[PDB]
């Protein structure tokens, strides 16, 4: 879904993201803040940004009106491919032209992106040392991340809520690199005694 869906942002960050990284016609979808778990289409038109609410009924998606769809992606495809079907109060047409990609949280090499728990356990045991760590995306809680650490291998969920990064609680961090740097210096302790030392990175190989 990364080509157009941004799970950890807000209307405000979607605005900024569309106005900096985007062009007129650029759009993204995101969770709703005014009614979870609806979704929201944020769209850039003629230098400004408009937010459109998507209803989540459990059996379909729609725009509180109009056609209904099995998936969010089908709804988005529909309004990309049928022009004039999306009109403001003034009757101005809203055009969904260019999906804005969800960028990776960092460009450091210990970030592996899409990667499973098991793939992380393999790479780390058969190519890392004790205290070898990486960060990856969470498949159990999409939108979140995971710190994968050689010690056996331990996985720690990294929550991303409102652009903040924490390790389940404790200090919220600005960027994913702040959280990693901070926990190298000051090791975290799992609640079974084990200290998760981040000793050396296991970088991606390409």
């Amino acid at each position: 879904s990364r080509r157009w869906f941004h799970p950890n942002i807000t209307g405000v960050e979607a605005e900024n993201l569309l106005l900096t990284r985007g062009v007129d016609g650029s759009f993204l979808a995101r969770p709703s803040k005014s009614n979870p778990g609806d979704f929201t289409l944020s769209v850039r038109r003629n230098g400004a940004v408009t937010h459109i609410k998507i209803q989540n009924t459990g059996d379909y998606y729609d725009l509180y009106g109009g056609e209904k769809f099995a998936t969010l992606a089908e709804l988005v495809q529909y309004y990309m491919e049928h022009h004039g079907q999306l009109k403001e109060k003034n009757g101005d047409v809203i055009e969904l032209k260019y999906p804005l990609n969800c960028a990776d949280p960092t460009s450091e090499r210990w970030f592996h992106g899409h990667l499973s728990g098991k793939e992380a356990e393999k790479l780390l045991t058969e190519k890392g040392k004790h205290g070898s760590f990486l960060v990856r995306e969470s498949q159990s809680h999409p939108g979140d991340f995971v710190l994968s650490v050689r010690t056996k291998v331990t996985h720690v969920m990294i929550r991303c809520q409102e652009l903040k990064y924490d390790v389940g609680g404790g200090e919220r961090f600005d960027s994913l690199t702040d959280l990693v740097e901070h926990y190298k210096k000051n090791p975290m302790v799992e609640t079974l005694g084990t200290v998760l030392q981040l000793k050396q990175p296991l970088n991606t190989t390409r």
Binding site: G11, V12, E15, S34, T50, H51, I52, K53, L63, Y64, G65, G66, L86, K87, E88, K89, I94
Partner: peptide, 7 residues
């Protein structure tokens, strides 16, 4: 931060 409606 303004929303919209289509209908």
């Amino acid at each position: 931060p303004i929303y919209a409606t289509i209908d």
